[PDB]
Design a protein around this nucleic acid. Sequence first.
RNA 1: ACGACCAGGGCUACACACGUGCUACAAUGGCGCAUACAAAGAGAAGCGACCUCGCGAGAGCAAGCGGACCUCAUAAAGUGCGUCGUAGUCCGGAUUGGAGUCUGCAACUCGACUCCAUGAAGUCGGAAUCGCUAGUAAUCGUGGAUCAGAAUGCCACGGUG
RNA 2: GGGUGAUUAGCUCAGCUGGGAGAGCACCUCCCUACAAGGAGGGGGUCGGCGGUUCGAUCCCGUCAUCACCCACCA
RNA 3: UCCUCCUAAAGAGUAACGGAGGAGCACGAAGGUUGGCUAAUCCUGGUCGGACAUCAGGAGGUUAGUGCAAUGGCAUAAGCC
Lengths: 113, 178, 79
Amino acid sequence: ARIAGINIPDHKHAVIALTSIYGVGKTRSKAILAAAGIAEDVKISELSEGQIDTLRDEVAKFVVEGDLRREISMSIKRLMDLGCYRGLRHRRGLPVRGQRTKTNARTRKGPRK
Amino acid sequence: AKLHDYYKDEVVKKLMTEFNYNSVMQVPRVEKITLNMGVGEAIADKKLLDNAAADLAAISGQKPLITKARKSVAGFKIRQGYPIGCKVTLRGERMWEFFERLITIAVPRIRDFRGLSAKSFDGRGNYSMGVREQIIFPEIDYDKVDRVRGLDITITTTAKSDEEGRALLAAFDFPFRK
Amino acid sequence: RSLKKGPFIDLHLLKKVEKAVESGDKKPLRTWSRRSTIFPNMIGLTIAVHNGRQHVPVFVTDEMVGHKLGEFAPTRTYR
RNA sequence: ACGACCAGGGCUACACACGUGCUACAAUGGCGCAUACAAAGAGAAGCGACCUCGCGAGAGCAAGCGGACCUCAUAAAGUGCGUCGUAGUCCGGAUUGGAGUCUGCAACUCGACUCCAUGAAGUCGGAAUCGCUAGUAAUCGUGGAUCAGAAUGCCACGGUG
RNA sequence: GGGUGAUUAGCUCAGCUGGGAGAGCACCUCCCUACAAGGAGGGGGUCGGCGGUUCGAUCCCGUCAUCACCCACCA
RNA sequence: UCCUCCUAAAGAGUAACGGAGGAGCACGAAGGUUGGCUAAUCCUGGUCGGACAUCAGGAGGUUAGUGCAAUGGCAUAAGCC
């Protein structure tokens, strides 16, 4: 139990603790289920050491675990100047993509008093 | 204690030889190692924290104690008999029984190295560390409804320069700055 | 790239941009359309961009990339 | 000259209260998988099959038919077998990141679409206001016009009760 | 100068043998028909100042500041 | 009324409706004894810890703790254990 899923429900479906975690969602969860060739319907296969933990290499070509944000957390510091539209909108909590502020902005502005 | 013969080669022996020393006493040694856990948490009802000390007693060479405070200045309205920690330190014989698996061979889930090495060292084992982020590995009675418990380590060495004593760390699962 | 491939410089700007490098002792180029594009390798030149009421002088840096003249530098304060 | 020509700009510039809508708040529901029963229209560098590349938007190669025939074109709700253990959740998806696909002088401001990650609210709505006496209140799916790119509004059509 | 009380929401005021910040009005916003009433929601607190003790003082205790009530006497 | 410091001029004695404060109890443990040990504060490193308790070291060494005001001592530790 918990050989890849980090949560205590160990008798349930192959999405539980195996999606939206450390750079893995449905599409990349399928890609390591495919790497080990195992079964997924109703429950994930009961498995031992040296069977799928050895195959994390077959899904490694993405930002994962300790590397999920590491280098972008330095690259995103590159623009900070107040005259730069991207610099200012990194230096303050603002959308670099641009949005409307007058009407239907209440998620970004948060709750009103 | 069944594992201590490695001390003649795997640690401090190349250091000993690159000064032409003849004794393990001319190079650093471990005075004491401490495995201390925190009890000062104030976010839930204090209900499962002695079984969290039993989870530490599954790897410590001495079982945790009740403990007492020394100050009563705190905003927690405590008496100086208030339990303040766990009191877990190893000297000599059962410290050779700790490195028998822990921080030496216990985890096969090694990481692709990006740079994270031992830090802030100065001249007396001046590096302190807790564990970061979850991967899960087998532990005793761990099918329990409680958050994942680790260990927070402190160590004291007979050193004067920890940068010179860097070979005392060579048998461990963690790296040192080049 | 994503906006129907390669960019285009409006001819009224393309006729006067390498004549600003290389600007002489004469005044910096005035531009009235903020819609005009600049290319990322452009550097070391001063230009004057219209905002609707004023003309704003700007020097082009190595940190300025392929912008429009409304994005590259603040032509109005404005709020 | 507030006339008229000429070029750039403005009409989603922001502060606060909405009128009418909409995905919903979970199980009169989702997730997975198979599957029944349609009308009305559009089609002269059109509609574009079969197949293929690309994670994908889209694009390549070229039949069929100038169109009761071919092509847009796998109706959905419903129906059958598994699953969820009622909790802001396997729910839900504003966000957040890196790069594309398509169009147009024009996409900062101010467009439509996509891939893999990534993430917060929402718990049936205060006084009150509105709809129907039956194919009626409610609800599911397909087209068309304007038109370079862009509607959830407009106009037709079929399903369930 | 002195005695006795007060100090908390804009106003009127609870909480006073040790922490839990609150009620009715008022204001703003909203519902009905023109103005109220009636019914909901919301904003905002050096809880006056300095010390004593205590983990902690709107609270207890001493002492300031500002206001009310009664005094400031013999010649 | 009982206590600390000054008032007080370095003997002894000592005044003031002289100047600053505490006490009205507390602990059978906070007493007895043998044996052992060494705190604060700051900094660096351990955060799942919400001003202050807390783990290791460097600097320091009755500056912390010593039941109370205040005075003074305490490593021989009267300190904590």
